[PDB]
Amino acid sequence: RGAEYVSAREWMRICFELLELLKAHKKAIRRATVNTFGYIAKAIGPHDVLATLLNNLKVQERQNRVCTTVAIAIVAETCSPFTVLPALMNEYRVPELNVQNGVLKSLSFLFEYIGEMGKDYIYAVTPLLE
Amino acid sequence: GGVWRNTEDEILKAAVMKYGKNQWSRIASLLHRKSAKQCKARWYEWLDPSIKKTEWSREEEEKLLHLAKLMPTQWRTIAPIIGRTAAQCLEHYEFLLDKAAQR
Amino acid sequence: AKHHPDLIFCRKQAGVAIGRLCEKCDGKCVICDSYVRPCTLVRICDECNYGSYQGRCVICGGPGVSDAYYCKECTIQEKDRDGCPKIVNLGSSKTDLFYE
Amino acid sequence: IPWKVPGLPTPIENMILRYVKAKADWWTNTAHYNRERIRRGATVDKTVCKKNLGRL
Amino acid sequence: MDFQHRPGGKTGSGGVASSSESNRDRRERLRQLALETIDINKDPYFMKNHLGSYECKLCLTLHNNEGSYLAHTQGKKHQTNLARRAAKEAKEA
Amino acid sequence: WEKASGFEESMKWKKLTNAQRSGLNQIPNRRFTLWWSPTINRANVYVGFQVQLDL
RNA sequence: CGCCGCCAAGGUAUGUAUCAAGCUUACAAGUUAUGUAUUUACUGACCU
RNA sequence: CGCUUCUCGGCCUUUUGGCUAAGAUCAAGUGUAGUAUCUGUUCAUCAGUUUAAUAUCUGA
Ligand SMILES: [Mg+2]
Ligand SMILES: [Zn+2]
Ligand SMILES: [Zn+2]
Ligand SMILES: [Zn+2]
Ligand SMILES: [Zn+2]
User: Fold this and answer.
1) Do A115 and C37 touch (CB under 8 A)?
2) Residue A11: burial class (beta carbons within 10 Å; 0-12, 13-18, 19+)
3) Residues facing residue C9 across a β-bridge
4) SS3 sequence of E16-83
5) Strand H positions closer than 7 A to protein CB
6) Residue B15: which of C70, E32, A2, A59 has the closest Cα?
7) Beta bridge partner(s), residue E55
8) Exposure winner among B51, C70, C72, F42, fewest CB in 10 A?
9) What's the number of CA atoms in the CB half-sphere (13 Å) around residue A43?
């Protein structure tokens, strides 16, 4: 409700700090912060916070890779699709276990959150799911 | 605690092989639990390649039996003298040969 | 829930008793444990909604704030038209944490 | 450390020994001097005192 | 104030991160350490897969991290069981 | 006077790189200078060059 | 018998490619596998 | 044909220089449910039990 009172640089420098805002054990912080990521990306576009949420996928710790998986789902569902899906397909080529599990669980929460809007994207992620 | 498992011991061997000898914070910066002093303690205790951690002999035992009688304590003093140099293997040899002399 | 497999549901016949959720578990589904797409109100039996058990959350058993819901994924799989999904037992979770 | 390196010619190693001995003489003669100066109260420098701690 | 003998720092630094980026860089540094030690030791059977885990090829065994592989040089000695493959390669010693 | 987190048992376990760990705290040295303000800033001992700030 | 009267450098970085005034001459000019001691990792939006 | 010397190339340490007080200092996490993978480790002939078929027991 107030995304016009900045210099457009602050929402980009707090989303890195919102990564360290995770691993808090209440489940209310961790369910509100993904909505904050979604409205940040609604404000300043889903192309710069996206690389931050994909760099949050090599942590070795849980409650920090699934809590950015949900953030990938919220940047997928708040603003329109086809802005997060090519890079989410691209990160599977990175030879690491955690980033591949993160992009698969982000596809899970993606289709879970979109429902009926997955009629056009099944043929695109079927070669990834195979 | 300092359990010092072998997966960290071989990493410490590779870190001593790459970096150096008096270079300890830079190699303890990659172990997630240990500081420099405990790594120094184990490397001068177990991981130095001049340590003869096995092959107990006859001459060093008869050397230390009238050397642990010169001084009853001070096993780390006589540890460069014997050449066993681990400073705890001498204690094991001492209590083992005193258990064998009592039985 | 699906997170802790040792929890069992009540599975008796559902009446007109509208289920409730606490402020800690608001928006949570009962079966799939999700947050989106609410479709069906939760109906529980009269034994699990009686006396001091009224206005009570389904999962944690705390004081209810909002109404409980089913998801559309539970609706089209028809996991809402089964028995009453009131969690009765509480084991190895929120019990040993009280002793620690 | 006694610095016994093998396979080395004698004139360069003993000229290194007398050069580090001359540096040691300058080092200890400056250590005595600034220790006496911070004893009687000449300088109040943190650099000189925190250096003279390790230089004693 | 003593501006010359204080613990100083440079402006615009940003500081140092939390535990996550620190042990991420620690695991990448231990990965580079393991790769350079097998580069010096010249091991042709060490292989990394498509998910960031290690494999002994004659062993056909997995290793979750670096020290899991570089402690597997003493046990289940198939490296001496390649003497049969060398005898198949050359009938004489 | 000051009571809020003076001992500060575990602050919040941050990193404390160089200066915020070992350096001195500037806020007591500025609140004490704020506390004696008319008699560290009095107008009539040296009545010459005065330097007013912006606004 | 009556000391003493304080400025600054030390901190908010500096290396670049364009665009006027400041200053300057106003000039020269057709081997699979088991059991266990035992770690390392991974999962469940696990949890005050 | 052999031998000594010189020059050119195919090359097997090259790290950002040196010195001061190793230049000085630093680096906390759980508890629950479950799984994968290393190290260590060890693998004489009828009848029935069991098992998809196999692999424990009693028998001479
Ligand atoms: Mg500086
Ligand atoms: Zn609840
Ligand atoms: Zn559901
Ligand atoms: Zn019920
Ligand atoms: Zn028996």
Assistant:
1) yes
2) buried
3) C87
4) CCCHHHHHHHHHHHHHHHHHHHHHHHCCCCEEECCCCCEEECCCCEEECCHHHHCCCCCCCCCCCCCH
5) 20-22, 24-33, 36-41
6) E32
7) E47, E62
8) F42
9) 20
CB B78 within 8 A of CB B67: yes
Count of H helices and E strands in chain D? 2, 0
Query: Would you give the distance in Å from CA B52 to the centre of its chain?
Result: 9
Tell me the sheet residues that pair with C71. Answer: C38
H-helix or E-strand spanning residue A69: helix A66-77
Residue A88 in tokens = 């989410």
Q: Which residue type does E27 have?
A: R
- Written as six digits, the tokens of A115 are 């429902």
Q: Which of helix, strand or coil describes residue A89?
A: helix
Residues B89, B91, B92, B96, Cα dihedral to 10°: 140
For chain E, the farthest-separated pair of C-alpha atoms sits apart, in whole angstroms, at 83
Q: What angle do CA B16, B20, B21 make, to 5 degrees?
A: 85
Residue for token digits 């941050």?
F14
Q: Please give the method by which this entry was determined.
A: cryo-EM
* Angle F17-F19-F22 from CA coordinates, rounded to 5°: 95
Give the integer Cα–Cα distance in Å for A49 and A110: 17
Backbone angles phi, psi at B35, to 5 degrees: -100, -170
C70: nearest Cα among C9, C23, C29: C29
- Looking at residue C40, the DSSP 8-state letter turns out to be E
CB-based contact E47:E55 (threshold 8 Å): yes
In this structure, are residues D47 and E5 in contact, taking their beta carbons and an 8 Å threshold?
yes
Asked whether the beta carbons of B20 and E81 are under 8 A apart, the reply is no
Residue D19 vs residues B35, D7, D13, D25, D55: alpha-carbon distances, Å? 37, 20, 10, 10, 19
DSSP count for chain C of H helices, then E strands: 2, 6
Distance, CA of B5 to C1' of G39, in Å: 8
- Are residues A22 and A64 in contact, defined by beta-carbon separation less than 8 angstroms? yes
Q: Which helix (H) or strand (E) holds B41?
A: helix B36-42
**What residue type is assigned to position A63 of the chain?**
Q
Nearest Cα residue in chain B from E28: B30
Name the residue in chain B with its Cα closest to that of E67: B7
Between the CA of B66 and the centroid of ligand 3 the distance, in Å, is 80
* CB-count exposure of residue B86 (10 Å: 0-12, 13-18, 19+): middle
Residue C48 annotated as lining a ligand binding site = yes
Token digits for A8? 């457009």
- The candidate with the shortest Cα–Cα distance to C25, out of C57, C3, C2, C71, is C57
* CB within 8 Å of E77: residues ≥ 6 apart: none
Which is nearest to A86 in space by CA: A121, A44, A37? Answer: A121
Give F26's contacts (C-beta < 8 A, 6+ positions apart). Answer: none
